[PDB]
Amino acid sequence: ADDFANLTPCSENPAYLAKSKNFLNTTNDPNSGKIRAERYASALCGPEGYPHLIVDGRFTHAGDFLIPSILFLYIAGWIGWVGRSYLIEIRESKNPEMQEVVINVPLAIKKMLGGFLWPLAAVGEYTSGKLVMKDSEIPTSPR
Amino acid sequence: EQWIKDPLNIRPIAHAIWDPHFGEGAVNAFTQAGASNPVNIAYSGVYHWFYTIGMTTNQELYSGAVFLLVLAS
Amino acid sequence: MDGSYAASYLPWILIPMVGWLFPAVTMGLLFIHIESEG
Amino acid sequence: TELSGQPPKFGGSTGGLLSKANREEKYAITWTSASEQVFEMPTGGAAIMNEGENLLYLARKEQCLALGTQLRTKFKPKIQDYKIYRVYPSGEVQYLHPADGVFPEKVNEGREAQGTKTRRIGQNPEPVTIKFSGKAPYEV
Amino acid sequence: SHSVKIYDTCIGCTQCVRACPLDVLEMVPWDGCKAAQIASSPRTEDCVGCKRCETACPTDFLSIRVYLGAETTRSMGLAY
Amino acid sequence: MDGLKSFLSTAPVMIMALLTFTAGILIEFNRFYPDLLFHP
Amino acid sequence: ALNRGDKVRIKRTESYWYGDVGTVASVEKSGILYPVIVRFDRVNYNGFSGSASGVNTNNFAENELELVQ
Amino acid sequence: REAKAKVSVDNNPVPTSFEKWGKPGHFDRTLARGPKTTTWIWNLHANAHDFDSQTSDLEDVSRKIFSAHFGHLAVVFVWLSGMYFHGAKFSNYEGWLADPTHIKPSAQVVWPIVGQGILNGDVGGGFHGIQITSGLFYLWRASGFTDSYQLYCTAIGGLVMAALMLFAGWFHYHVKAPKLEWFQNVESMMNHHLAGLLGLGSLGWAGHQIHVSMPINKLLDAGVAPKDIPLPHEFILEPSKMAELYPSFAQGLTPFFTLNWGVYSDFLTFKGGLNPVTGGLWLSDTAHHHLAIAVLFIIAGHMYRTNWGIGHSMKEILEAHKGPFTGEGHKGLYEILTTSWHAQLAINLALLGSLTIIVAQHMYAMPPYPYQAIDYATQLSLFTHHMWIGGFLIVGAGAHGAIFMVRDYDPAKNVNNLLDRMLRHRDAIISHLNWVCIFLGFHSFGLYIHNDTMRALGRPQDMFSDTAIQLQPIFAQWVQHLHTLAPGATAPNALATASYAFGGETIAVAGKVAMMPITLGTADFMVHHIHAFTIHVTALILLKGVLYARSSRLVPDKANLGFRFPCDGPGRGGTCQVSGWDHVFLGLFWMYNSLSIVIFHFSWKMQSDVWGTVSPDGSVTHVTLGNFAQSAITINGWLRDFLWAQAANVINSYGSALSAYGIMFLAGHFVFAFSLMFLFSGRGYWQELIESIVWAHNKLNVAPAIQPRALSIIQGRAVGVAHYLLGGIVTTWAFFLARSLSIG
Ligand code: CLA
Ligand code: CLA
Ligand code: CLA
Ligand code: CLA
Ligand SMILES: CCCCCCCCCCCCCCCC(=O)OC[C@H](COP(=O)(O)OC[C@@H](O)CO)OC(=O)CCCCCCCCCCCCCCC
């Protein structure tokens, strides 16, 4: 009801309106400032006029952090999984090191393209595969 | 004792200066906080401590210093 | 340099003593002790 | 006894012996040369070794050993008969290198074994087990 | 001076003696490796501590170890 | 030849190619849809 | 008892390959304290500063090896 | 292609192929076996151009060096053509040429995106872009460029030349590879570099100035406007168009061959001063100077004997120079400078860096290009740029001197020559240089400390100032006086002073001052002694690194350790940074320090006692109101009235076309702080951290086959010093540019 009493919506904040009347054009679009002033009037602003972001977790602000978080998690899992499987397939090529320096382009592309299913292959390797390794089979230093 | 009369305006002084390198400008600059001689102003809040503790005269601080000499002994 | 506080003659000679006599004496004693026996 | 050999042909330098050679100790390298040759001085600059015997005084033992390695690794007829001694201000001479007339690189009978641990590296005693003593894991 | 210890994991490749710049080490007969020899440190009073013997050692972690101790004119490498 | 492809497949060439490709992707995305601070 | 080709794990604690896997190359005859020659795929630390790789072989004893295949 | 010459090449030594491009590390046998540790990668870049560590053949090394020279010349041609094309199709050179005094030289337009379009500030005439400080427009006006199409044509010619140099490198490393005999023709190479490269170059440039620069500029200064000037070649097609400007042209080149040179006094002048219209050197004076320099260099290019008996044998000259103090003298130096590439590189780097610093000092006070003295940003930028180039080249000269000492020094061929005796009293040399540096440091910085303490205590009369205890630089004042009295006496035909910095008229163009007498006082004395001190410390570090590369009392076998090694263990008390490379590493920091104080002195003195505006009264109001005398004598003065004050432009640069300067300011600060991590730590901690992270990757089987290794000690040092220099120099770059662009 009265949550975040220190902040007000950017449309209801006069400083934000005054500043958005003079927002600067970003690209070649002369309305880039106008469209930015129209898009940022949605969020909550502070007394100065700049929008504050809310990561509290509520789905009213699901775009402030939740959606970029999901997108980056997907893409970074893709990168990590394709790189890991590329390194593991490299492990069995007699000369793995010089293929780690000189990138096998076809194998790398085949690993990369088949990366859209990383979150499923991950649990596939976790359930009974090679994702996690036993501690006693890992080289360590003296204690 | 002067600081207790007006704590919000009088700045507390740690101790006096005695430096032969000083010139007239430095002497005039460091004769501050209503002191007749060059002095450094305190910045450790020990004045507020001693006042809130109940010490109101110089003789109390003096006897405390002497007693602490005895404690170190 | 002066002092409206009592015994203002004490820093007069006490500042050179803490700054010249005491350091020279302590440094000389410690120097002799560092280079003792041989 | 008395060290013999001609000093190398050298014009002098500021890197040679200092007050230590007469107050503390000095070292000497002797070597025989098949011809008048040019070698590098461990103290900087070039010198000329005479054909026959050469005696040279140096300030530190590592300098004589550097000269020895240069004699044995940088010349067509390798000079390996070099000897290194330590001279004291009382004129005393202590033969040093090679210790038993044979270079230490290759095994030779008659040599005792010192600093040899019967155990492994990782088998040293824990320091807590030898604390408040004047010893370290590698000493007991 | 510095301590130079040798352990039973010695293979007798004589590299640490060849690497020593102050003739601290020797190759003495032994019966614990193929080369039938082991390293020794008879002239430790001339050790400076340059760790070259350790650098030239092949065993998985060195069989010869140098521990820096009481410094002197010889250990500090002073020509004065 | 084969060596030319092997040179074109080295680590710096591939990494700079991917970085330039991703740079183009992001630059064009922010060119046509700019000032995307948050998702509506 | 170990032969050539025996994949084994090193138990020397202080070893660089303690917990890693190495293949046996040869076993020297009796008398030697560490006869089992084990070659490795991951080079160790040996070499002067800035050098390329390291050493990929070392001699151990039977007691310091755990047998795999 | 013999032509009865000394040319000798190999018709096909190296086949052309692409397979080796797929084997990174082909030049190093230790790297050809493939990577096993990450260090393999780094060393691949470290030894890339280290041709000596790749092959022991001096001939193959000379061939690699020659083709690499050709490649670098192609790169510099590409860069020069890029600059010309950006002036052609991306600059306001014509709008500027039409009215310089009211427009800012702009180039490099920024694509409006993500807000960066704000960097295209209005420079005048409606043009929007980034103001450039390289001074290209002034140089092009001096050359006589009128049309952007000509800048385009110069760019095309430069790209053609780049292709030519690249083809020449390929042709002389794969087709006709010259022999080692051909490179060792130092007498011929010297004759040609003096006569052919330098002599002919200045001769042709004097010709271009007489036919293009001088006539066009003579009209340009008189207000004829660019579009009304005939093309440069219309002056060659019409001799009357040259005779109307210079009646001396009407007599033709007949007075030249008959030594009737005075007739040419119309266009070959000795005015000495500056052009009152534009504030640059007289192009007649520069053409006369290029003519004299050309004749001098051509005459010099005949000294050395080649294929005709006449000439000087440099070996005989070097060996003939020996005295009672120096033994056999310069004997063996011919063999050194003929069989060693690093000795040549050290000498040439030293002299070239010195020449670059001299270029900076001679261009700041004698503005040669039109309207370059008016622009304070361009002046400061060119000054500090050439300063830093010279400093780096000098540090490299020290590096290669040490490299020669370790690699190419032969004691068997240096028996009692100059180098031998230097090695034999290096202790005396270095101890006395140590003392000199200490005496200067006490007697320069210590004077500043005295002034700080005296002013802080309220004792201004006890300071080293013009108003208290004066340190008048009497000698420099006397020499300035002699310079201001030279025209008419010790310079009879010279019309004016060589430069007004020594004194004379306060030449001002437009509303600003171009060059006025630069007075010298107590603060100038103190700053010059700071300069001497820092230069001496840097030279001490580098010279000690060179002389002690082979051996020392600590390490008598240092040469066997090499030029680039971290140390020789913690023994002997500790022997870190004993190598010559580490001496270069430290000399880098001290060169940075020296040059930073030099350029700060330049900026503050120019802004304080030189740069400024002039009101129609003769009176001059300087940029920062002459605060150099009373403020540049304490360190607090440099902190407050120079750093704190003049960085206000850089910090408040946000929201304007200079926000990039604030960004790069913060970026240089960050890179300095980042360098500190590589400079203060050690490799072992990082290797242990990498071990833990490698275990973590082993937990998920992401362990790379190329084992991650911490940076080597030498590499850690190189990275630290590189980031330190980068951060500091970029910081002062942003600061200087923003400041000198926000002072009008
Ligand atoms: C650690 C406590 C301490 C400190 C930091 C100071 C600080 C100072 N005093 Mg003071 N003083 C102290 C205690 C202290 N005092 C005590 C307890 C007395 C009464 C006996 C005095 C009486 C005294 C006089 C009469 C004067 C000063 C003066 C000064 C100034 C110059 C020092 C000097 O010349 O006198 C030297 C100090 C003494 C002779 C007294 C001995 C100090 C105590 C008893 C011992 C401190 C030991 C302590 C462990 C420090 C050891 C060093 C440490 C590394 C272990 C200086 C700012 C002068 C001044 O007024 O400046 C303008 C001066 O005139 N002091
Ligand atoms: C008049 C003859 C002549 C000329 C002008 C040059 C000029 C040059 N030499 Mg060369 N040289 C000569 C004779 C000559 N040399 C002889 C006889 C020998 C045998 C002893 C050598 C052996 C030699 C070696 C081993 C090397 C050079 C190098 C260089 C270049 C380094 C300087 C530089 O970068 O400046 C500025 C650069 C330029 C101005 C670029 C222009 C380069 C063009 C292609 C040359 C001049 C044009 C040509 C003379 C045609 C002019 C016709 C027309 C314009 C009138 C330079 C361009 C060094 C090098 O390669 O550096 C890259 C090098 O390694 N010289
Ligand atoms: C004509 C000048 C010249 C010549 C040809 C050489 C030639 C050579 N030098 Mg020398 N040197 C020079 C100038 C020169 N140098 C200067 C100016 C310095 C002072 C810094 C030095 C200091 C020096 C040292 C300390 C060393 C050499 C070494 C070498 C040899 C190895 C080359 C190499 O390192 O590979 C290639 C070079 C690199 C991989 C370095 C790349 C690092 C870049 C440039 C970082 C700089 C940043 C960049 C400028 C701007 C930032 C961009 C960034 C944000 C992307 C080589 C034969 C090495 C040697 O051992 O000699 C045998 C060596 O240790 N030189
Ligand atoms: C502000 C920082 C700083 C300062 C103070 C110094 C100081 C010095 N450096 Mg150094 N250096 C620095 C940074 C600094 N360095 C950094 C970051 C590096 C890493 C690259 C180096 C690396 C370096 C090298 C490689 C070398 C030096 C050298 C020197 C010495 C030069 C000789 C000299 O000037 O005479 C003396 C000057 C001073 C001592 C300045 C202070 C003088 C004050 C004002 C007087 C003090 C009054 C009185 C004594 C105080 C008494 C106190 C009281 C309680 C008793 C000098 C002592 C060179 C050298 O050794 O010279 C031969 C040298 O080779 N430096
Ligand atoms: C403001 C400008 C900043 C100037 C800072 C200059 C820093 C000077 C530091 C001194 C060392 C320089 C000599 C290096 C040569 C050198 O020997 O350095 C020292 C170091 C050598 O280490 P080691 O002694 O272990 O090498 C021995 C090996 O050869 C073993 O065989 O090499 C490295 O730093 C490796 C890192 C390479 C980094 C690879 C990155 C490649 C960059 C690609 C782009 C290049 C730039 C293009 C031009 C724009």
Ligand SMILES: CCCCCCCCCCCCCCCC(=O)OC[C@H](COP(=O)(O)OC[C@@H](O)CO)OC(=O)CCCCCCCCCCCCCCC
């Ligand atoms: C306050 C007023 C007093 C001013 C007097 C100042 C001058 C007195 C000290 C000057 C040193 C004289 C020695 C050089 C005169 C000279 O070179 O003599 C010549 C002599 C070598 O000559 P040779 O007879 O061997 O000539 C044969 C050659 O062709 C072969 O090399 O050099 C030496 O004796 C080595 C000693 C040099 C070491 C001294 C250098 C010290 C640096 C001095 C820096 C002060 C001024 C720097 C300004 C840039």
Ligand SMILES: CC1=C(/C=C/C(C)=C\C=C\C(C)=C\C=C\C=C(C)\C=C\C=C(C)\C=C\C2=C(C)C(=O)CCC2(C)C)C(C)(C)CCC1
């Ligand atoms: C017979 C007896 C009792 C009666 C006791 C009576 C009759 C009095 C008791 C007095 C007591 C217990 C006094 C405790 C005094 C402690 C004092 C006074 C100070 C300690 C100060 C210290 C340690 C340091 C102080 C410092 C100094 C000096 C300063 O000046 C600045 C502050 C600070 C730096 C802290 C009762 C019936 C109750 C129980 C039955 C036995």
Ligand SMILES: CC1=C(/C=C/C(C)=C\C=C/C(C)=C\C=C\C=C(C)\C=C\C=C(C)\C=C\C2=C(C)CCCC2(C)C)C(C)(C)CCC1
């Ligand atoms: C949402 C939210 C949030 C947060 C929360 C949290 C706290 C979370 C967490 C979490 C956690 C606590 C986690 C942990 C974990 C563990 C693990 C263990 C994981 C990982 C793993 C793995 C195994 C991986 C793998 C992979 C993949 C899959 C891909 C790529 C490659 C790789 C290999 C990397 C916030 C507040 C911010 C906002 C609002 C709400």
